[PDB]
Amino acid sequence: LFPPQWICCDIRYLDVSILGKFAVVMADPPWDIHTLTDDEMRRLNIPVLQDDGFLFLWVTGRAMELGRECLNLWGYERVDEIIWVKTNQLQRIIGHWLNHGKEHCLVGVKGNPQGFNQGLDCDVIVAEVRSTSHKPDEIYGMIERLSPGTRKIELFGRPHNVQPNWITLGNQLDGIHLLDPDVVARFKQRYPDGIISK
Amino acid sequence: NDYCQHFVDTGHRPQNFIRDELIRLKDELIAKSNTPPMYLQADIEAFDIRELTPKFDVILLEPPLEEYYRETKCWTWDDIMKLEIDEIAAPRSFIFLWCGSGEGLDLGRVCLRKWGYRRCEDICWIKTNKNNPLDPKAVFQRTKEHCLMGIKGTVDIDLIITEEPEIGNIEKPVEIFHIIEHFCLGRRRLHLFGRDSTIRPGWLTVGPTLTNSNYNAETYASYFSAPNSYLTGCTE
Ligand SMILES: CNc1cc(N2CCC[C@@](O)(CNC(=O)c3ccc(CN4CCC(C)CC4)cc3)C2)ncn1
Ligand SMILES: [Mg+2]
Numbered sequence A: 001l002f003p004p005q006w007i008c009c010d011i012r013y014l015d016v017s018i019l020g021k022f023a024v025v026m027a028d029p030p031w032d033i034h035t036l037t038d039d040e041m042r043r044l045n046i047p048v049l050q051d052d053g054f055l056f057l058w059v060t061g062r063a064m065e066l067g068r069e070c071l072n073l074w075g076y077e078r079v080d081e082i083i084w085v086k087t088n089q090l091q092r093i094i095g096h097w098l099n100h101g102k103e104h105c106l107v108g109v110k111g112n113p114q115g116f117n118q119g120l121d122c123d124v125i126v127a128e129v130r131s132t133s134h135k136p137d138e139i140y141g142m143i144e145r146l147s148p149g150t151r152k153i154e155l156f157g158r159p160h161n162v163q164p165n166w167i168t169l170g171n172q173l174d175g176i177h178l179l180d181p182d183v184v185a186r187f188k189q190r191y192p193d194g195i196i197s198k
Numbered sequence B: 001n002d003y004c005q006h007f008v009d010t011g012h013r014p015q016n017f018i019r020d021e022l023i024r025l026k027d028e029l030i031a032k033s034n035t036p037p038m039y040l041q042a043d044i045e046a047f048d049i050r051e052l053t054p055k056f057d058v059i060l061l062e063p064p065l066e067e068y069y070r071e072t073k074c075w076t077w078d079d080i081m082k083l084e085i086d087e088i089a090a091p092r093s094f095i096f097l098w099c100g101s102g103e104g105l106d107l108g109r110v111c112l113r114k115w116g117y118r119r120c121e122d123i124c125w126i127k128t129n130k131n132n133p134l135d136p137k138a139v140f141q142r143t144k145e146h147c148l149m150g151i152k153g154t155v156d157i158d159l160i161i162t163e164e165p166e167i168g169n170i171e172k173p174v175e176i177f178h179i180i181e182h183f184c185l186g187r188r189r190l191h192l193f194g195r196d197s198t199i200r201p202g203w204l205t206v207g208p209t210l211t212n213s214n215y216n217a218e219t220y221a222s223y224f225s226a227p228n229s230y231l232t233g234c235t236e
């Protein structure tokens, strides 16, 4: 359970029913802006992943609107929106009309989550831009304080995103690495030969 | 390092720790081009918006939301969505809609679409708390407000950082006017739900709490009749 787990896969075709239920879902999708088409995004089997809990959905450009669509489509209500203010190592700030100083993360809720620590953190992140397309590590702290110890799943993560209590899905991860006994069982039953295709 | 952990430890919001050519010509040409301030007391709920002519190049829309009075007439998004904004917007024009930080982030986007705009920017007003270290649905402590920019028809960053105003003070940062003005979108600029305290050269202010009016549609239109009809507001 607790240590990092991941699955190299195409999230369009993985049968995520084998993974169980999660208290938090995070997704950093490759939106078709300026890649997954809008219809592929809509059809992701997000709804099987949670009964009660929160989704964190990174958005940019016209995905600020499309991501709201998917959010409601998948059965969530948007109840918050986090912005990461991007700075340099000296704590200064680093889509025509305006230059962009921030990235947006929608926060959706599904069901009636209980036992979460709402209101410990504020809705702003100030953190240094490390690598291009590298999300700030503070989000995992906010998410852990919000729901400590619970199961979490990240979609479209990269190898640097693997964290304890998290399962990371992405098409540039190194193989399959699963340790939760229930997951390992249902993965073997669904994929006896270790291949993920249709 | 981790300013979110630091905010949990001390109560200093992460934005407290943000630090810090010549776009002065723009602002000087704005000033030479600006019309005199015009303003009109009007109960916008009961007011036929079509009497505000000519069509506007820019609309700043600042409805008084209940969330602005937490510990202190409020407009709901129901009221706001029913404004006939499309009837006064020029066929190419821009809107800036203050949406708060709750459901307005969604309902203000429905408004923009209803009035025929597409959202091109999301301007965040990030409020620091250096001088003083929840909604039921909230997951996090809300320390910002959003002003959505919309465009219909065919310099600056999208962040404003200021100290959080005192309780009961509903003013938005005057920085929003510089962002709008720096665009040079045209000279017909309308501020709906402005106040005595927001009246400004280059702008027609309309709101219920204004104590005086000087608006005259013919006088106002004379500011933009030939040869002045298409100036950006950033020329001689
Ligand atoms: C075809 N189906 C796929 C596709 C797929 N991916 C496609 C290939 C890369 C992938 O593997 C790793 N994700 C990224 O690199 C990635 C990185 C950055 C961003 C944008 N961010 C926005 C928010 C900000 C905090 C950070 C910037 C978006 C994605 C994901 N993974 C599984 N199935
Ligand atoms: Mg933009």
Ligand SMILES: [Mg+2]
Residues within 6 Å of the ligand: A130, A134, A135, A136, A137, A160
């Ligand atoms: Mg990192």
Ligand SMILES: [Mg+2]
Residues within 6 Å of the ligand: A121, A122, A123, A124, A125, A126, B003, B004, B007, B014
């Ligand atoms: Mg924070």
Ligand SMILES: [Mg+2]
Residues within 6 Å of the ligand: B027, B178, B179, B182
């Ligand atoms: Mg200026």
